[PDB]
Coordinates of C-alpha atoms and ligand atoms in Angstrom, one line a residue:
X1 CA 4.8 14.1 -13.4
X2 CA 3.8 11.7 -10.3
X3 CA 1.0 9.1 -10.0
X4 CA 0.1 8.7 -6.4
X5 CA -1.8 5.0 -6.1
X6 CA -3.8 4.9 -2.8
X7 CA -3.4 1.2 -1.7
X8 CA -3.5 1.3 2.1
X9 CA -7.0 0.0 1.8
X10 CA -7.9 -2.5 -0.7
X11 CA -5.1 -4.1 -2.8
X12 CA -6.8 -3.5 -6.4
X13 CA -4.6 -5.6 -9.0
X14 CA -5.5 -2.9 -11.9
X15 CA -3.5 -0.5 -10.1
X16 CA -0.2 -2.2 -8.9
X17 CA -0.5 -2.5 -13.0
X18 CA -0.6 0.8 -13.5
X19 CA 2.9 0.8 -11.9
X20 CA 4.1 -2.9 -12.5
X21 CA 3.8 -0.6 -15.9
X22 CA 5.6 2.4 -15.0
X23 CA 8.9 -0.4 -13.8
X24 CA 8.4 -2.2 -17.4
X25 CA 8.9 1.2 -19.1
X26 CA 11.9 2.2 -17.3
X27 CA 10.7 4.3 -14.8
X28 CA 11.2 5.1 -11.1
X29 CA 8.3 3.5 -8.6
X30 CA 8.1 4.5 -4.7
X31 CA 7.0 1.4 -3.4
X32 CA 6.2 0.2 0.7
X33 CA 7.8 -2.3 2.4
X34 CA 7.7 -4.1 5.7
X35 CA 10.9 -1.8 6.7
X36 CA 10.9 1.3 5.1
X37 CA 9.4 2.6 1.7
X38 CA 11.8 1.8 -1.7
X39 CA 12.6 3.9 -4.5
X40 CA 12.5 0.8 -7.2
X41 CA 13.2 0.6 -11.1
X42 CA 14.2 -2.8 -13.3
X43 CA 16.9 -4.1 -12.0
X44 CA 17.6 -5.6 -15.5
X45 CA 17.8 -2.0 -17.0
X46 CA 21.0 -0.1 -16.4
X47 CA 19.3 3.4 -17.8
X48 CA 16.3 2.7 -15.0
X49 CA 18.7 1.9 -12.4
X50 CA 20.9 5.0 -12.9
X51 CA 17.8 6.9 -12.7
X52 CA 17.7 5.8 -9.2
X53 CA 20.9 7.5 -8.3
X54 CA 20.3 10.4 -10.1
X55 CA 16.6 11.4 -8.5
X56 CA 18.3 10.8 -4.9
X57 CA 21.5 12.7 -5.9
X58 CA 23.2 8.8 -4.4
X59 CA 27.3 8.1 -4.4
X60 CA 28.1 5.6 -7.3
X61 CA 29.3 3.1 -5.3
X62 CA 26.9 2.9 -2.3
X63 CA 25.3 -0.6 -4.0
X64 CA 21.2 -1.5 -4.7
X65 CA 19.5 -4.1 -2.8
X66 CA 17.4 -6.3 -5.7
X67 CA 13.9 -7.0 -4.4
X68 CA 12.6 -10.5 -5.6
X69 CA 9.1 -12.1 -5.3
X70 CA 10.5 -15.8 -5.6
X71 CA 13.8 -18.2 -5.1
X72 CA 13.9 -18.9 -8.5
X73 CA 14.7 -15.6 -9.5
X74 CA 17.5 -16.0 -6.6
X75 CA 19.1 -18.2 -8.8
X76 CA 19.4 -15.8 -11.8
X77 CA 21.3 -12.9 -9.9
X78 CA 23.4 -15.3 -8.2
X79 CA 26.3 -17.7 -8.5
X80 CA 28.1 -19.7 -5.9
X81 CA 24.8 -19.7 -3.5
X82 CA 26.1 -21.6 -0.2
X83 CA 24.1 -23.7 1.8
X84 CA 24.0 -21.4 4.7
X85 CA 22.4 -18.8 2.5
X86 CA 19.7 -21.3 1.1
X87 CA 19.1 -22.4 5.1
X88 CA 18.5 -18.2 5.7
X89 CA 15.7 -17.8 2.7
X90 CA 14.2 -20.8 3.7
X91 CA 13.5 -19.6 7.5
X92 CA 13.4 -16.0 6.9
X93 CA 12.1 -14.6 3.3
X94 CA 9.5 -13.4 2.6
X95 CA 11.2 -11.1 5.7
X96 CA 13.8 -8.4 6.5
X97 CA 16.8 -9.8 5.3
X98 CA 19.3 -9.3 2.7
X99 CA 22.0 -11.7 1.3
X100 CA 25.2 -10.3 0.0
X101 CA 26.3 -13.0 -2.7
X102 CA 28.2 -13.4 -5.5
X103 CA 27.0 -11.7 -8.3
X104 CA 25.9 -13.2 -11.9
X105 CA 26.2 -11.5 -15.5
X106 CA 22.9 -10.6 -15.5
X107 CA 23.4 -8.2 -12.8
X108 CA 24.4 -4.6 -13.8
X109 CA 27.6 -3.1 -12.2
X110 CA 25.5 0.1 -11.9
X111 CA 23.8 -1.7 -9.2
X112 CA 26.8 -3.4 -7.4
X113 CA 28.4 -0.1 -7.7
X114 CA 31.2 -1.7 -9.7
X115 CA 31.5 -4.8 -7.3
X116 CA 31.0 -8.7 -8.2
X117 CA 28.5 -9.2 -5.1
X118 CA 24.9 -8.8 -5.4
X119 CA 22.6 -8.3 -2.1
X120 CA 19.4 -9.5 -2.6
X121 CA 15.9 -9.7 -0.2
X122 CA 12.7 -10.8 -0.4
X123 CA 10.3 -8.0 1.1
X124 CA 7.4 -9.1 3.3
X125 CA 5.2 -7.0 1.8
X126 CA 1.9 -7.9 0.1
X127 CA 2.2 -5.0 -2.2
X128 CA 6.0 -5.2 -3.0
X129 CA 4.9 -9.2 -4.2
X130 CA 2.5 -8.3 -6.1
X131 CA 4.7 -5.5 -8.1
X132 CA 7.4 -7.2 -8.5
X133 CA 5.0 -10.6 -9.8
X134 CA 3.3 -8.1 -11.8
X135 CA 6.2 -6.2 -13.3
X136 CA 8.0 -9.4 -14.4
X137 CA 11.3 -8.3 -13.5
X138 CA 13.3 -8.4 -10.0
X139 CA 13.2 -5.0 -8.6
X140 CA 16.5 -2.6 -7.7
X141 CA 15.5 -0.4 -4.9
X142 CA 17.1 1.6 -1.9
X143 CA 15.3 3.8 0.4
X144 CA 13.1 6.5 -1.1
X145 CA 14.5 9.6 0.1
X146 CA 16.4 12.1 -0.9
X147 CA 20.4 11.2 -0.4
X148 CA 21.6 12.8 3.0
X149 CA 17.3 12.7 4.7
X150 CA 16.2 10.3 6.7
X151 CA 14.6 7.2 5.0
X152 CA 11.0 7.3 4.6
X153 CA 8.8 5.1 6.3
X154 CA 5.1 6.5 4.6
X155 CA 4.2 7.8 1.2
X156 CA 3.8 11.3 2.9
X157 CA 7.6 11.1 3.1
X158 CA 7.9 10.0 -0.4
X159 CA 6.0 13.0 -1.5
X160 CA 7.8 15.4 0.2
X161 CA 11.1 14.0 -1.5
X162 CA 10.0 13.3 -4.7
X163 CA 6.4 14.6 -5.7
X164 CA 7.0 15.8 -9.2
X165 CA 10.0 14.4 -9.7
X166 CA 9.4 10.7 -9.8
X167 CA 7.0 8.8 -12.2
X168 CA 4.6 6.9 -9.2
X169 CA 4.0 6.4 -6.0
X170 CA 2.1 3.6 -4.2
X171 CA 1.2 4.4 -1.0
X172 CA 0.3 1.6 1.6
X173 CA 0.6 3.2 4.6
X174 CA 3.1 3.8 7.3
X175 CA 5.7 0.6 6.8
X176 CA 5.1 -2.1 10.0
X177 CA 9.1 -2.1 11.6
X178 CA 10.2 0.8 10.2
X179 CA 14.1 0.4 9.8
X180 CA 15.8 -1.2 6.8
X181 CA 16.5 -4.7 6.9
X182 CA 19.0 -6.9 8.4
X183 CA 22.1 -7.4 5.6
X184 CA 24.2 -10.6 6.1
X185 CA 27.5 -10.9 3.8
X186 CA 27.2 -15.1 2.6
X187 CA 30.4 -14.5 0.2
X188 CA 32.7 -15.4 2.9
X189 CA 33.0 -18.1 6.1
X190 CA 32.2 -16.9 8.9
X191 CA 29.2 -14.5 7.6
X192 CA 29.6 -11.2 8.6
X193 CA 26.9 -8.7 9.6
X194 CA 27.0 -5.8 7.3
X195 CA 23.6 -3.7 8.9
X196 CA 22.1 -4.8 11.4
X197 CA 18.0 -4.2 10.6
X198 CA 14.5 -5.2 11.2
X199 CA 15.6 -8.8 11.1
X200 CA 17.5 -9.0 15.0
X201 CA 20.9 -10.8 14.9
X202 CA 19.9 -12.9 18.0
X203 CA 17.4 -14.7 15.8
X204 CA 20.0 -15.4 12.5
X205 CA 22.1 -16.6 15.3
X206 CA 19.5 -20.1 16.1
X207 CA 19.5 -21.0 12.5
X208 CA 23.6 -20.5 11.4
X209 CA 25.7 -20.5 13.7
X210 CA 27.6 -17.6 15.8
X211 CA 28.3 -15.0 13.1
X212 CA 31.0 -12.0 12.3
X213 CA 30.3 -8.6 13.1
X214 CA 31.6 -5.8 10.5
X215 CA 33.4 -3.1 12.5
X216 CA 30.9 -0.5 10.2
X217 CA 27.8 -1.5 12.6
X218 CA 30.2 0.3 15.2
X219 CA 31.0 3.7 13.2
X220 CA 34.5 2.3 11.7
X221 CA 35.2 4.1 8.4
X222 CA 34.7 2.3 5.3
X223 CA 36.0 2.7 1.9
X224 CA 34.3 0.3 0.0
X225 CA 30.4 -0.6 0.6
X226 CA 29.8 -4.0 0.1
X227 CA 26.4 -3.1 1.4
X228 CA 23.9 0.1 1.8
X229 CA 24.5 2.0 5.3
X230 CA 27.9 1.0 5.6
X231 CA 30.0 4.5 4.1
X232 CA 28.0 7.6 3.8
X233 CA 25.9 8.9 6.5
X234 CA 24.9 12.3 5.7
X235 CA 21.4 11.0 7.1
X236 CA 21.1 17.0 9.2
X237 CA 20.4 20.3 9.3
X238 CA 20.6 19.6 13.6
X239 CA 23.4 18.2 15.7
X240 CA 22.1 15.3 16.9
X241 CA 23.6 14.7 20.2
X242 CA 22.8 10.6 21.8
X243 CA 22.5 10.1 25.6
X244 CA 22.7 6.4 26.5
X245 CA 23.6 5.2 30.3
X246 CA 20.8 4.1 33.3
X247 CA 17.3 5.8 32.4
X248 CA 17.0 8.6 35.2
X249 CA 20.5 9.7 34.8
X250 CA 20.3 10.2 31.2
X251 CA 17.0 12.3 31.4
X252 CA 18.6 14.4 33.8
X253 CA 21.3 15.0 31.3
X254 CA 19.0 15.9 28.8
X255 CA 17.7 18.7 31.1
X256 CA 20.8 20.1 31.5
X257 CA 21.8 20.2 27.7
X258 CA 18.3 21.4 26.9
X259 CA 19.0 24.3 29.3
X260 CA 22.4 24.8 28.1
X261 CA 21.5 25.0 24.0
X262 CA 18.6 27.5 25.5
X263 CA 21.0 29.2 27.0
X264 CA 22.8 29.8 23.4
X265 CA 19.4 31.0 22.1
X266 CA 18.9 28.0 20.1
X267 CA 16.0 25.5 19.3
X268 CA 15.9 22.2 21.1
X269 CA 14.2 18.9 19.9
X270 CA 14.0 15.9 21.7
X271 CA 13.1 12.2 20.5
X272 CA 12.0 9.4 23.8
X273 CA 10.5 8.9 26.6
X274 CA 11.0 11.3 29.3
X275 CA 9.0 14.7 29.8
X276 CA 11.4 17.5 28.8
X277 CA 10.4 21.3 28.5
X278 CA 12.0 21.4 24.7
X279 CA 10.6 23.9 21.8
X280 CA 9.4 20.2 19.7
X281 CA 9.6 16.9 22.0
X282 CA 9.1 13.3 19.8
X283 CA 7.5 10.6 22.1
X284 CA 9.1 7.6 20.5
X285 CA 7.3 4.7 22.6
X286 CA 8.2 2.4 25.9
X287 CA 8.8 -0.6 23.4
X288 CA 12.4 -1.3 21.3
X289 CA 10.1 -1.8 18.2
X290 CA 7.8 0.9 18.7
X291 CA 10.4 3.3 18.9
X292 CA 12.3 1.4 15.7
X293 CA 8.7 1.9 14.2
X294 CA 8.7 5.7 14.6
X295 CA 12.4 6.6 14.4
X296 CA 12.3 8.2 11.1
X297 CA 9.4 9.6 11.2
X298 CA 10.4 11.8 14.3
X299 CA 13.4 12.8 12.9
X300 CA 11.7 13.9 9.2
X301 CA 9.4 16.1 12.1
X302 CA 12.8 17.9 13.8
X303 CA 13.9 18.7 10.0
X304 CA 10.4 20.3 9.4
X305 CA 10.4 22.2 12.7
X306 CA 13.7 23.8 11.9
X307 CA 15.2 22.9 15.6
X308 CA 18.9 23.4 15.7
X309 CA 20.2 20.2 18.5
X310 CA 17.8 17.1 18.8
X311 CA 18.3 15.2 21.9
X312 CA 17.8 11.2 21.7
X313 CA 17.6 9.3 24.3
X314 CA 19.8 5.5 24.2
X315 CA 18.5 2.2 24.0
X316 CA 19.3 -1.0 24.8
X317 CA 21.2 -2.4 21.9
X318 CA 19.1 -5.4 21.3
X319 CA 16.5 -7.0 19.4
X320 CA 15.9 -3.8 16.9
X321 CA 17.6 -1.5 19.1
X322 CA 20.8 -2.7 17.2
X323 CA 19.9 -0.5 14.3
X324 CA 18.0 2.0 16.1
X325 CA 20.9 3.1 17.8
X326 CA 23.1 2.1 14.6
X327 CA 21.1 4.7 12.4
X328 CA 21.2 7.3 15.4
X329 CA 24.9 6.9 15.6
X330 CA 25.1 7.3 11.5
X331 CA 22.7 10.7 11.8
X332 CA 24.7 12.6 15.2
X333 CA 28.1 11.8 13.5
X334 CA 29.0 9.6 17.0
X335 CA 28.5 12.1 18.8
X336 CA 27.9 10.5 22.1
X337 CA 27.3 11.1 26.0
X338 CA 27.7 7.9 27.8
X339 CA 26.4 8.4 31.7
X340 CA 27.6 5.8 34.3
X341 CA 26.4 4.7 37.5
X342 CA 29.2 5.8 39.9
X343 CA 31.1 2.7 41.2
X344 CA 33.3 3.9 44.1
Ligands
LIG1 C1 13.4 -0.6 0.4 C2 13.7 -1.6 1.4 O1 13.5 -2.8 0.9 C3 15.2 -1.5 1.8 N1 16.1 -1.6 0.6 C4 15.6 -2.5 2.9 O2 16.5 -3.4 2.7 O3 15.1 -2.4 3.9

């Protein structure tokens, strides 16, 4: 069935129409982005959009982000637009941020899943633009994998998801932060921090003021997603066990679970820094956003190597380490070892 447009060159306008197409038609286009690579239809069409949920197997009510190309078309999905979200477009879109508003008529429950708020971004993305300026239509797209895998953050990732089973694919490379964006609720004072993503709170903070953070950015069970990556978190075949505390305490934790899963003749995968003598070992980078920028992609490689535990070293949460140790938290279930510096 698929269409796989090579793009991570030369933008050629005659194929993003080829897929601008494909969206027009009512069909399902893998697209990048500047966080991770979307699985995008007409947000206008409610058959397109349920298509969406249907090729990643995706819960009802776990709601669409609507992809938009300019603020005019803002104005068309929602009502009620507050001045604190027309200060955040203004500083931050094109970027990695997402608005939760109040929805319009024109918006399809299918993509609210049944709510009357709408969250809508503009993606820094060249590519994304020029789709979505091509297409004619504001685009409804979540991540592009498989409900219950790790998001996909290349076109190889697509593929493996989706090769026959979607209509296109455009592939522009590996996507430049790598988590999904940053998702601010605006449909209530104070705003409240839904995700946090590749846009870092400390930075939404200079431009509003202080804002809210929802108790699901800490694990806290919700019933109803207002947002993506709120509810479900089905994204492993591997426990994933998380080891935060001081560095050279935490490594030498690592050895001794390593040793210990060993021990119970099982496979052991490890994503950081350290040098660990594991069956697969994931070097994730010394930098917050160079490990952000290969998160996924390490743990689509522990899936593939069949390993039964994968090991993550913490990080500091701050800047993107916020969501890179959100997303890690969603994928081990909490399951956590917290190491302490001995105060005695
Ligand atoms: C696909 C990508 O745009 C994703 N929905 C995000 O908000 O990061």
């Amino acid at each position: 069935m698929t269409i796989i447009i090579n793009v991570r060159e030369r933008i050629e306008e005659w194929k993003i129409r080829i897929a601008a197409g494909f969206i027009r038609e009512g069909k399902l286009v893998a697209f990048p982005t500047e966080t991770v690579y979307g699985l995008g239809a007409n947000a206008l069409d409610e058959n397109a959009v349920k298509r969406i949920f249907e090729a990643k197997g995706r819960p009802a009510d776990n709601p669409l982000i609507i992809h938009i190309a300019s603020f005019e078309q803002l104005e068309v999905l929602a009502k009620e637009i507050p001045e604190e979200a027309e200060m955040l477009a203004k500083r931050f879109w094109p970027g990695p941020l997402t608005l939760v508003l109040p929805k319009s008529e024109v918006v399809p429950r299918v993509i609210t899943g049944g709510l009357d708020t709408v969250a809508v971004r503009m993606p820094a993305h060249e590519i994304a633009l020029k789709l979505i300026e091509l297409s004619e239509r504001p685009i409804a797209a979540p991540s592009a994998n498989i409900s219950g895998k790790p998001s996909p953050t290349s076109a190889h990732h697509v593929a493996e998801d989706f090769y026959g089973k979607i209509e296109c694919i455009i592939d522009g490379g590996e996507t430049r932060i790598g988590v999904e964006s940053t998702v601010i609720d605006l449909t209530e004072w104070p705003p409240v921090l839904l995700r946090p993503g590749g846009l870092p709170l400390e930075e939404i903070e200079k431009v509003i003021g202080e804002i809210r953070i929802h108790p699901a950015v800490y694990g806290k069970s919700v019933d109803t997603a207002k947002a993506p990556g709120m509810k479900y978190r089905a994204a492993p075949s591997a426990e994933v066990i998380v080891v935060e505390g001081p560095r050279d305490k935490v490594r030498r934790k690592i050895e001794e679970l390593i040793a210990k899963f060993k021990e119970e003749g099982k496979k052991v995968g490890v994503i950081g820094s350290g040098s660990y003598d594991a069956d697969e070992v994931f070097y994730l980078g010394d930098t917050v956003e160079e490990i952000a920028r290969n998160l996924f992609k390490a743990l689509r490689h522990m899936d593939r190597t069949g390993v039964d535990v994968i090991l993550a070293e913490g990080v500091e949460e701050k800047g993107l380490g916020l969501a890179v140790m959100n997303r890690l938290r969603k994928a081990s279930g909490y399951r956590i070892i917290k190491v302490h510096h001995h105060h005695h």
